[PDB]
Amino acid sequence: MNAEDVKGFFASRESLDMEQYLVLDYYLESVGDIETALAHFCSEQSTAQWKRVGVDEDFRLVHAAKVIDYEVIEELEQLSYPVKGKIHACRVTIAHPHCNFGPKIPNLLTAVCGEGTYFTPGVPVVKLMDIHFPDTYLADFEGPKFGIEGLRDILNAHGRPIFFGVVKPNIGLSPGEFAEIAYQSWLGGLDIAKDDEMLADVTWSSIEERAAHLGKARRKAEAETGEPKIYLANITDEVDSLMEKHDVAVRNGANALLINALPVGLSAVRMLSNYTQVPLIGHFPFIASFSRMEKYGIHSKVMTKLQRLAGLDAVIMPGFGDRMMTPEEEVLENVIECTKPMGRIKPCLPVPGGSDSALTLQTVYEKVGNVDFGFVPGRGVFGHPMGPKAGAKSIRQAWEAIEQGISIETWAETHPELQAMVDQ
Amino acid sequence: MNAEDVKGFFASRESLDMEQYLVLDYYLESVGDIETALAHFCSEQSTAQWKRVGVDEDFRLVHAAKVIDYEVIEELEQLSYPVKHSETGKIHACRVTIAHPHCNFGPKIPNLLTAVCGEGTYFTPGVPVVKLMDIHFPDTYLADFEGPKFGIEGLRDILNAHGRPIFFGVVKPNIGLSPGEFAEIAYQSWLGGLDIAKDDEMLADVTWSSIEERAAHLGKARRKAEAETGEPKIYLANITDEVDSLMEKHDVAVRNGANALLINALPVGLSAVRMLSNYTQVPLIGHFPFIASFSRMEKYGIHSKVMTKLQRLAGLDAVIMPGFGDRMMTPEEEVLENVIECTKPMGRIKPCLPVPGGSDSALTLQTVYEKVGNVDFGFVPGRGVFGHPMGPKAGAKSIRQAWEAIEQGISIETWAETHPELQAMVDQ
């Protein structure tokens, strides 16, 4: 980068038509002249060369990403990570012109966290902290088709969280065996019975068969509790066959589908979302590989944001445990990304889970601040000493307690299922 | 995990039908009893519960992942990365080898990813730091994948390039240019002796340059360059777009003249690449954007060679990767592991062309060739080609002159005494 040139990779947002730019927040550690490196960073992610030699033109104006602001946190004695001048930890805000990639997700990813993002010479440590989309960009995306209202409408669940339950054991079981356990939890009061993140279409349990069995069980549970129930079938498979698994699962009774977001691809999720006749909910496998390092990779809330934009009606994410290795603040940022306004894009249900039970519902509810979220108790439900129906019943009893200001313990004095959980 | 139970997450490979297992190498740091944690690790990635209460059954035998071997590197005073976790106890850096039964996910990539590096992999309570170091696929698993359709032989057949590397060149400037303008620069580099002229990782189908138009122009330019040099030329059109429209961009780019397609592997999805690979009438080559987000930390995430491995399996005919520079932030050993993953035997799956690039020019070709050990790789000089002082044709010509030098044992400098284009590059 040349002194004169640096100048053209900066700008005040006040001087730009921000409706043509995406706003990215990055955490990075620069080496050598700070502003020169930031320029390079911008250049590499956009126009690396903004003119033909001997030609009077400048592609930067419309195609260059520009630093609209940055802050030097501090000077470090060394990088935060031993990766192959003075080094500074910075927080930079960049305006990237979206006309370079358009409303295509793969292309977005290729620009805001591709080669330029992680290989700019003087910027060896980088972490995408956030992405702010202007309405004109958003206007080219559908968003989730059901969102929170859609889910609540189906389950007729209002003024309370939605209750998820992962049918355990998962693997080893057969469609029939699996179906009886799901059936019990639904009778107990579970709202959603889901296939484990790792089930999907396999030889010993095909989506066709499991869907046939669980759909029949689902209906029966509805008829007996008089309450709508939903069976969350895991449909993640090769992209080439997503739409078909949807057809098989849906016609057989699955009324909601689960897909592992990244292993499939955000772009693939978008295709599937524009095709579903049913609510689509995403799981978080793989995200941890690039969102755990505090100062490197991509912040998990960006992936949640993208899951919502791609069209997922609910996003399962690491929860308020501490057994799910995520700081509460982060779990909270993710929850909010699912529900905050995003120009015409419906909010999706945040489903923070990981180490919950009837005994933590109270706490999760207080941290979230409202009742719009899914609760996925991982213990004391299917493993409940009195059986699956009892486990589910204990979760709803714990909720009733909260609904009345009574403590879980007090409420448990007159509720056996909740009491058994308290004894543990 | 319960003492008795740990026992069931271990096994000697000698006791297993390894044709039913994938072999994963992990680097991890455990907290507390080592073997208990390894068991948990296995459990979480497979059978978390292997029986219904009060029932005499064990799903572990056929559905559990099992530790067939591990080595305790050393005891650490602290984790390598400050990760917020529950566990308490001694922490050890281990290298563990695991046999994961593939009947749990089958020959589907998304499902593979969900198992070998999903929730169980990164959230097992006592194992807060983990990095997938390698994946070894048995032939029976491999037997359900196609692999690249052209591979190294296919590419060499098209370019009629034998006994030398394949020469790539990213047409610069990329962005700002228009189909016509872009086409003239590509045309020069082909006349100069470039084998492949490619769209930048960030071009693709945009308003100011649509794949339709750029392909029409470059295809016409490609043909002309072939007619004039008498040598086959290939135009690498960047087709990455939403999955839903991959197959169509292929049709538009191909019918217009693009004879090879470029797709950003991860932003699109390995699974998507597989779909596209089973559909191409043309060689498919992948780029590496995004991979760095999870393969840079020395002890966390996924080793980059695993992604190269998957790119080959998915069906890519060539894999562009960070090269032997040092300006591409990758240790030479790693760049080398990746190269070898593209070419080593992988049961019926064709080898793909390794394209290590990043900071090369006519002056480093010699070195890259020596490190690779053979001539099966793509060279992507990023400087001194299009920016060459004597023009694009000159830049390309200098790269091929540098290669001729090597082909004769003569030093680049000596050879440059009688070759102006190569000399100009030497003056810099």
Mutation for testing the B interface, residue in A126, A242, A264 having most B CBs under 10 Å: A264
Same domain, A89 and A179: no
Note down the domain range covering A158: 142-424
Same domain, B168 and B133: no
Chain A: closest CA distance from residue B60 (Å): 8
Q: Could you say which of B129, B145, B161 is where a domain stops?
A: B145
Q: Could you say which of A141, A158, A191 is where a domain stops?
A: A141
- Of A191, A221, A168, A112, nearest to A383 by C-alpha is A168
Q: Which residue of A has its CA nearest to B301?
A: A289
Please give the Cα distance from B52 to A160 (Å, whole number): 31
What one-letter code names the amino acid at A196?
D
Same domain, A359 and A422: yes
Please give the Cα distance from A265 to B269 (Å, whole number): 5
- Cβ neighbors of B279 (< 8 A, separation 6 or more) are B247, B250
Which DSSP symbol is given to A114? S
Query: E strands of A9-115, at which residues?
Result: 21-31, 66-76, 87-97
Angle, helix B420-427 to helix B392-407, in steps of 10 degrees? 100
Angle, helix B270-277 to helix B246-256, in steps of 10 degrees? 50
Closest CB to B301 among A115, A169, A290: A290
Q: Which residue of A has its CA nearest to B269?
A: A265
CB-CB neighbors (< 8 A) of B298 in chain A: 81-82
Same domain, A87 and A147: no
Q: What is the largest CA-CA distance in chain A?
A: 86
Q: Which residues partner with A194 through β-bridges?
A: A166, A232
Q: Which residues partner with B263 through β-bridges?
A: B286
- Please report where in the chains the tokens 């990767």 appear, as a residue: B321
Same domain, A38 and A99: yes
CB-CB neighbors (< 8 A) of B119 in chain A: 197, 283-285, 288
- Of B266, B295, B265, nearest to A297 by C-alpha is B295
| A285 to B113: CB separation less than 8 angstroms, yes or no | yes
Closest CB to B244 among A200, A271, A326: A271
- Of B382, B172, B389, B241, nearest to A59 by C-alpha is B172
Give the CA distances from residue B156 to residues A184, A284, B165, B232, B318, in Å, rounded to whole numbers and listed in that order. 62, 41, 9, 10, 11
| B63 to A171: CB separation less than 8 angstroms, yes or no | yes
Please give the Cα distance from A92 to A94 (Å, whole number): 6
Residues in chain A whose C lies over 2.5 Å from the next residue's N (breaks after) = 84
First vs last C-alpha separation in chain A: 64
CB-CB neighbors (< 8 A) of B321 in chain A: none
Chain B: closest CA distance from residue A116 (Å): 9
Please give the Cα distance from B98 to B417 (Å, whole number): 57
Could you tell me the two tokens for A154? 């189906």
- Of A121, A133, A18, A136, nearest to A69 by C-alpha is A18
Please give the Cα distance from B323 to B306 (Å, whole number): 16
Which DSSP symbol is given to A128? E
Closest CB to A197 among B119, B242, B358: B119
What H or E segment, with its residue span, contains residue A57? none
Which DSSP symbol is given to A173? -
Give the CA distances from residue B210 to residues A48, A102, A233, B267, in Å, rounded to whole numbers and listed in that order. 20, 12, 39, 20
Please give the Cα distance from B37 to B39 (Å, whole number): 5
Contact indicator for B282, B234 with CB cutoff of 8 Å: no
Mutation for testing the A interface, residue in B144, B209, B293 having most A CBs under 10 Å: B293
Closest CB to A118 among B122, B266, B293: B293
Residues belonging to chain B: 428
Contact indicator for B317, B151 with CB cutoff of 8 Å: yes
Please give the Cα distance from A334 to A324 (Å, whole number): 14
- Of B253, B241, B151, B158, nearest to B196 by C-alpha is B158
What does DSSP say about strands B91-101 and B21-31: parallel, antiparallel, or unpaired? antiparallel
Long-range contact pairs involving A383-389 (C-beta distance under 8 Å, separation at least 24) = A383/A168, A383/B53, A384/A417, A384/A420, A384/A421, A385/A420, A385/A424, A386/A416, A386/A417, A386/A420, A387/A184, A388/A181, A388/A184, A388/A185, A388/A188, A389/A184, A389/A185, A389/A187, A389/A188
Burial of A79 (0-12, 13-18, 19+ CB in 10 A): middle
Please, how many CA atoms are within 13 Å of residue A300, restricted to the half-sphere of its CB?
29
By what method was this entry solved? Answer: X-ray
Q: What is the CATH number of the domain that holds A96?
A: 3.30.70.150
Please, how many CA atoms are within 13 Å of residue A422, restricted to the half-sphere of its CB?
16
- Cβ neighbors of B167 (< 8 A, separation 6 or more) are B193, B194, B195, B196, B378, B379, B381, B396, B399, B400, B403
- Please report where in the chains the tokens 């895991």 appear, as a residue: A234
| B173 to A109: CB separation less than 8 angstroms, yes or no | no
A224 C-beta neighbours (distance < 10 Å), count = 12
The SS3 assignment for A146 reads: coil
Nearest 5°: the CA angle A184, A257, A367 is 75
Taking phi first (over 0 means left), then psi (-120 to 50 degrees means alpha), and beta for anything else, what does residue B136 get? beta
CB-CB neighbors (< 8 A) of B29 in chain A: none
CB-CB neighbors (< 8 A) of A106 in chain B: 240-243, 264, 267-269
CA A377 and chain centroid, separation: 18
What does residue B300 show for φ and ψ, rounded to 5 degrees? -150, 145
Please give the Cα distance from A389 to A379 (Å, whole number): 13
- Of B288, B402, B406, nearest to B356 by C-alpha is B288
- Of B244, B264, B252, B246, nearest to B198 by C-alpha is B264
What one-letter code names the amino acid at A79?
L
Burial of B420 (0-12, 13-18, 19+ CB in 10 A): middle
Closest CB to B289 among A48, A110, A121: A110
Please give the Cα distance from B59 to A163 (Å, whole number): 28
Q: Could you say which of B93, B114, B145 is where a domain stops?
A: B145
Omega of the bond leading into A285 within 30 degrees of 0 (cis): no
Please give the Cα distance from A96 to A20 (Å, whole number): 8
| A107 to B204: CB separation less than 8 angstroms, yes or no | yes
Could you tell me the two tokens for B267? 């932003």
Give the CA distances from residue A213 to residues A174, A180, A207, A249, in Å, rounded to whole numbers and listed in that order. 10, 9, 10, 11
| A171 to B241: CB separation less than 8 angstroms, yes or no | no
Taking phi first (over 0 means left), then psi (-120 to 50 degrees means alpha), and beta for anything else, what does residue A196 get? beta
Give the CA distances from residue A220 to residues A194, A216, A230, A390, A394, in Å, rounded to whole numbers and listed in that order. 17, 6, 12, 18, 21
Mutation for testing the A interface, residue in B43, B171, B175 having most A CBs under 10 Å: B175
- Of A73, A72, A46, nearest to A61 by C-alpha is A46
| A121 to B327: CB separation less than 8 angstroms, yes or no | yes
- Of B132, B181, B187, nearest to B303 by C-alpha is B132
Please give the Cα distance from A69 to B358 (Å, whole number): 29
A128 C-beta neighbours (distance < 10 Å), count = 24
Could you tell me the two tokens for B261? 């397609």
| A114 to B201: CB separation less than 8 angstroms, yes or no | yes
Residues in chain B whose C lies over 2.5 Å from the next residue's N (breaks after) = none
- Of A62, A73, A86, nearest to A127 by C-alpha is A73
Query: Three-state SS across chain B?
Result: CCHHHHHHHECCHHHCCHHHEEEEEEEEEEECCHHHHHHHHHHHHCCCCCCCCCCCCCCHHHHCCEEEEEEEEEEECCCCCCCCCCCCCCEEEEEEEEEEEHHHCCCCHHHHHHHHCCHHHHHCCCCCEEEEEEEECCHHHHCCCCCCCCHHHHHHHHHCCCCCCEEEEECCCCCCCCHHHHHHHHHHHHHHCCCEEECCCCCCCECCECHHHHHHHHHHHHHHHHHHHCCCCEEEEECCCCHHHHHHHHHHHHHHCCCEEEEEHHHHCHHHHHHHHCCCCCCEEEECCCCHHHHCCCCCEECHHHHHHHHHHHCCCEEEEECCCCCCCCCHHHHHHHHHHHHCCCCCCCCCEEEEECCECCCCHHHHHHHHCCCCCEECECCCCCCCCCCHHHHHHHHHHHHHHHHCCCCHHHHHCCCHHHHHHHHC
A123 C-beta neighbours (distance < 10 Å), count = 23
Closest CB to B242 among A47, A49, A267: A267
Q: Which residue of B has its CA nearest to A317?
A: B119
| B269 to A264: CB separation less than 8 angstroms, yes or no | yes
Q: Which residues partner with A21 through β-bridges?
A: A97
Chain B: closest CA distance from residue A325 (Å): 5
CB-CB neighbors (< 8 A) of B104 in chain A: 171, 198, 202
Please give the Cα distance from B427 to B362 (Å, whole number): 12
Same domain, A129 and A171: no
- Please report where in the chains the tokens 């690491």 appear, as a residue: A318
Chain B: closest CA distance from residue A158 (Å): 30
Which DSSP symbol is given to A377? B
A19 C-beta neighbours (distance < 10 Å), count = 11
Q: Which residues partner with B122 through β-bridges?
A: none
Give the CA distances from residue A227 to residues A246, A361, B423, in Å, rounded to whole numbers and listed in that order. 24, 21, 81
Same domain, B426 and B349: yes
Q: Which residue of A has its CA nearest to B238?
A: A107
| B51 to A326: CB separation less than 8 angstroms, yes or no | no
What H or E segment, with its residue span, contains residue A170? none
CB-CB neighbors (< 8 A) of A114 in chain B: 201-202, 264, 267, 289-290
Taking phi first (over 0 means left), then psi (-120 to 50 degrees means alpha), and beta for anything else, what does residue A87 get? beta
Contact indicator for A250, A228 with CB cutoff of 8 Å: no
A423 labelled as ligand-binding?
no
Same domain, A116 and A43: yes
Query: Three-state SS across A285-305?
Result: CCCHHHHCCCCCEECHHHHHH
Contact indicator for B175, B200 with CB cutoff of 8 Å: yes
- Torsion sign over Cα A375, A378, A380, A381: positive
CB-CB neighbors (< 8 A) of B173 in chain A: 47-52, 59
The SS3 assignment for A132 reads: strand
Same domain, A114 and A215: no
CB-CB neighbors (< 8 A) of A84 in chain B: 326, 329-331
Please give the Cα distance from B419 to B427 (Å, whole number): 12
Contact indicator for B68, B16 with CB cutoff of 8 Å: yes
Q: How many domains does chain B fold into?
A: 2
Order across the sheet with B129-136: list the strands.
B66-76, B91-101, B21-31, B129-136, B301-302
| B50 to A169: CB separation less than 8 angstroms, yes or no | yes
The SS3 assignment for A9 reads: helix
- Cβ neighbors of A90 (< 8 A, separation 6 or more) are A27, A28, A29, A30, A34, A38, A70, A71, A72, A73
Burial of B345 (0-12, 13-18, 19+ CB in 10 A): exposed
Please give the Cα distance from B177 to B180 (Å, whole number): 8
| B84 to A168: CB separation less than 8 angstroms, yes or no | no
What does DSSP say about strands B129-136 and B234-238: parallel, antiparallel, or unpaired? unpaired
- Cβ neighbors of B88 (< 8 A, separation 6 or more) are B31, B32
The SS3 assignment for A234 reads: strand
Helices (H) and strands (E) in chain A, counts: 19, 13
| A52 to B177: CB separation less than 8 angstroms, yes or no | yes
Closest CB to B106 among A110, A202, A263: A202
Query: E strands of A141-286, at which residues?
Result: 162-166, 192-194, 230-234, 256-260, 280-283
Which DSSP symbol is given to A66? E
Q: Which residue of A has its CA nearest to B178?
A: A59
What does DSSP say about strands A256-260 and A280-283: parallel, antiparallel, or unpaired? parallel
- Please report where in the chains the tokens 């500074």 appear, as a residue: A88
| A236 to B111: CB separation less than 8 angstroms, yes or no | yes
Could you tell me the two tokens for B406? 């090597």
Task: Give the count of Cβ contacts less than 8 A between chain A and B.
Answer: 282
- Please report where in the chains the tokens 């959980």 appear, as a residue: A421
Please give the Cα distance from A411 to A403 (Å, whole number): 11
Same domain, B98 and B85: yes
CB-CB neighbors (< 8 A) of A83 in chain B: 296, 329
What residues of B are designated binding site for Mg(2+)? 198, 200-201
Same domain, B97 and B161: no
- Please report where in the chains the tokens 């305006």 appear, as a residue: A95
A196 labelled as ligand-binding?
yes
Q: Which residue of A has its CA nearest to B65?
A: A171
Burial of B76 (0-12, 13-18, 19+ CB in 10 A): middle
Q: What is the CATH number of the domain that holds A163?
A: 3.20.20.110
- Please report where in the chains the tokens 């995406």 appear, as a residue: A22
Please give the Cα distance from B58 to B43 (Å, whole number): 13
Could you tell me the two tokens for A120? 């700019």
CA B184 and chain centroid, separation: 30
Contact indicator for B133, B303 with CB cutoff of 8 Å: yes
Same domain, B91 and B200: no
First vs last C-alpha separation in chain B: 64
The SS3 assignment for A43 reads: helix
As a dihedral over the C-alpha atoms of residue A55, residue A57, residue A59, residue A62, rounded to 10 degrees, the angle is -170
- Torsion sign over Cα A324, A325, A331, A337: negative
